[PDB]
Design a protein around this ligand. Structure first.
Ligand SMILES: CC(=O)N[C@@H](Cc1ccc(P(=O)(O)O)c(P(=O)(O)O)c1)C(=O)N[C@H]1CCCCN(Cc2ccc(-c3ccccc3)cc2)C1=O
Length: 106
Protein backbone atom coordinates (compact mmCIF):
# COMPACT_ATOMS: atom_id res chain seq x y z
CA UNK A 1 0.00 0.00 0.00
CA UNK A 2 1.06 3.50 -1.02
CA UNK A 3 -1.12 5.34 1.50
CA UNK A 4 0.99 3.74 4.23
CA UNK A 5 4.17 4.98 2.55
CA UNK A 6 5.81 7.89 4.31
CA UNK A 7 6.50 9.58 0.94
CA UNK A 8 2.85 9.42 -0.15
CA UNK A 9 1.24 12.82 0.55
CA UNK A 10 -2.03 12.05 -1.18
CA UNK A 11 -4.27 14.85 -2.33
CA UNK A 12 -2.24 18.04 -2.05
CA UNK A 13 -1.94 20.64 -4.81
CA UNK A 14 1.04 21.50 -6.98
CA UNK A 15 1.35 24.84 -5.13
CA UNK A 16 1.42 23.08 -1.77
CA UNK A 17 3.93 20.47 -2.95
CA UNK A 18 6.13 23.40 -4.02
CA UNK A 19 5.56 25.12 -0.71
CA UNK A 20 6.94 22.01 1.04
CA UNK A 21 9.81 21.33 -1.33
CA UNK A 22 11.08 24.93 -1.50
CA UNK A 23 12.75 24.82 1.87
CA UNK A 24 16.43 25.86 1.87
CA UNK A 25 17.29 22.81 4.01
CA UNK A 26 16.06 20.32 1.42
CA UNK A 27 18.94 18.83 -0.57
CA UNK A 28 18.58 17.83 -4.28
CA UNK A 29 16.19 14.96 -4.78
CA UNK A 30 13.99 15.62 -1.74
CA UNK A 31 10.61 14.26 -2.86
CA UNK A 32 6.99 13.38 -2.32
CA UNK A 33 4.33 11.52 -4.36
CA UNK A 34 0.84 13.02 -4.58
CA UNK A 35 -2.32 12.50 -6.61
CA UNK A 36 -2.32 13.76 -10.18
CA UNK A 37 -4.38 17.00 -10.11
CA UNK A 38 -6.09 16.07 -13.38
CA UNK A 39 -5.37 12.57 -14.47
CA UNK A 40 -7.58 10.13 -12.59
CA UNK A 41 -5.73 7.10 -11.25
CA UNK A 42 -2.37 8.83 -12.07
CA UNK A 43 0.17 10.23 -9.61
CA UNK A 44 2.69 13.00 -9.46
CA UNK A 45 6.31 12.74 -8.30
CA UNK A 46 7.40 16.16 -7.08
CA UNK A 47 11.13 16.54 -6.58
CA UNK A 48 13.36 19.34 -5.39
CA UNK A 49 16.46 20.46 -7.34
CA UNK A 50 19.24 23.00 -7.05
CA UNK A 51 21.60 24.47 -9.60
CA UNK A 52 23.38 27.80 -9.99
CA UNK A 53 21.08 28.98 -12.77
CA UNK A 54 17.71 28.28 -11.13
CA UNK A 55 18.77 27.97 -7.49
CA UNK A 56 16.24 25.93 -5.48
CA UNK A 57 13.38 24.73 -7.71
CA UNK A 58 10.85 21.90 -8.11
CA UNK A 59 10.08 19.48 -10.97
CA UNK A 60 6.91 17.39 -11.26
CA UNK A 61 6.78 14.03 -13.01
CA UNK A 62 3.55 12.40 -13.97
CA UNK A 63 3.38 8.72 -13.02
CA UNK A 64 0.96 6.64 -15.00
CA UNK A 65 -0.63 3.36 -14.03
CA UNK A 66 -2.05 0.98 -16.60
CA UNK A 67 -4.83 -1.59 -16.12
CA UNK A 68 -2.24 -3.92 -17.65
CA UNK A 69 -0.67 -3.28 -14.24
CA UNK A 70 2.52 -1.29 -14.46
CA UNK A 71 3.46 2.07 -13.02
CA UNK A 72 5.85 4.32 -15.00
CA UNK A 73 7.04 7.84 -15.79
CA UNK A 74 8.15 6.68 -19.27
CA UNK A 75 6.33 3.66 -20.75
CA UNK A 76 9.73 2.22 -21.60
CA UNK A 77 10.56 1.68 -17.91
CA UNK A 78 7.75 0.02 -15.95
CA UNK A 79 7.36 -1.31 -12.41
CA UNK A 80 4.81 -3.47 -10.61
CA UNK A 81 4.22 -0.91 -7.91
CA UNK A 82 4.68 2.71 -6.94
CA UNK A 83 7.10 1.60 -4.19
CA UNK A 84 9.24 -0.24 -6.73
CA UNK A 85 9.27 2.84 -8.99
CA UNK A 86 10.36 5.06 -6.11
CA UNK A 87 13.14 2.61 -5.16
CA UNK A 88 14.38 2.48 -8.77
CA UNK A 89 14.53 6.27 -9.10
CA UNK A 90 16.38 6.58 -5.75
CA UNK A 91 19.28 4.75 -7.51
CA UNK A 92 19.01 6.14 -11.08
CA UNK A 93 18.67 9.78 -12.13
CA UNK A 94 17.80 8.81 -15.77
CA UNK A 95 15.50 11.64 -17.04
CA UNK A 96 14.82 13.08 -13.55
CA UNK A 97 16.33 16.32 -12.24
CA UNK A 98 18.18 14.22 -9.56
CA UNK A 99 17.92 10.71 -8.11
CA UNK A 100 15.30 10.56 -5.30
CA UNK A 101 17.15 11.08 -1.95
CA UNK A 102 14.87 11.62 1.10
CA UNK A 103 11.20 12.24 1.90
CA UNK A 104 10.13 15.88 2.04
CA UNK A 105 9.61 17.36 5.52
CA UNK A 106 6.12 18.55 6.59
C1 LIG B 1 2.89 21.89 -15.37
C2 LIG B 1 3.91 21.00 -14.77
O1 LIG B 1 4.53 21.24 -13.73
N1 LIG B 1 4.02 19.91 -15.53
C3 LIG B 1 4.91 18.79 -15.24
C4 LIG B 1 4.19 17.44 -15.27
C5 LIG B 1 3.09 17.50 -14.23
C6 LIG B 1 2.42 16.34 -14.54
C7 LIG B 1 1.20 16.04 -14.03
C8 LIG B 1 0.66 16.91 -13.16
P1 LIG B 1 -0.89 16.39 -12.52
O2 LIG B 1 -1.94 17.47 -12.86
O3 LIG B 1 -1.72 15.31 -13.33
O4 LIG B 1 -0.77 15.92 -11.15
C9 LIG B 1 1.28 18.07 -12.74
P2 LIG B 1 0.24 18.96 -11.66
O5 LIG B 1 -0.54 19.96 -12.36
O6 LIG B 1 -0.50 18.21 -10.63
O7 LIG B 1 1.32 19.50 -10.91
C10 LIG B 1 2.57 18.46 -13.25
C11 LIG B 1 6.09 18.72 -16.20
O8 LIG B 1 5.90 19.11 -17.38
N2 LIG B 1 7.28 18.31 -15.71
C12 LIG B 1 8.43 18.13 -16.60
C13 LIG B 1 9.57 17.71 -15.66
C14 LIG B 1 10.99 17.44 -16.32
C15 LIG B 1 11.17 18.13 -17.65
C16 LIG B 1 10.53 17.33 -18.79
N3 LIG B 1 9.11 16.85 -18.68
C17 LIG B 1 8.87 15.88 -19.78
C18 LIG B 1 9.67 14.66 -19.51
C19 LIG B 1 10.90 14.37 -20.17
C20 LIG B 1 11.69 13.29 -19.71
C21 LIG B 1 11.24 12.51 -18.60
C22 LIG B 1 12.03 11.37 -18.06
C23 LIG B 1 12.02 11.05 -16.67
C24 LIG B 1 12.59 9.85 -16.20
C25 LIG B 1 13.17 8.96 -17.12
C26 LIG B 1 13.27 9.29 -18.48
C27 LIG B 1 12.70 10.50 -18.96
C28 LIG B 1 9.98 12.78 -18.00
C29 LIG B 1 9.18 13.84 -18.47
C30 LIG B 1 8.14 17.09 -17.70
O9 LIG B 1 7.04 16.51 -17.69
Amino acid sequence: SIQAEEWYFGKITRRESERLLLNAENPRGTFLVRESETTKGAYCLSVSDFDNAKGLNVKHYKIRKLDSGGFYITSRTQFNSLQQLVAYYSKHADGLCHRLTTVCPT
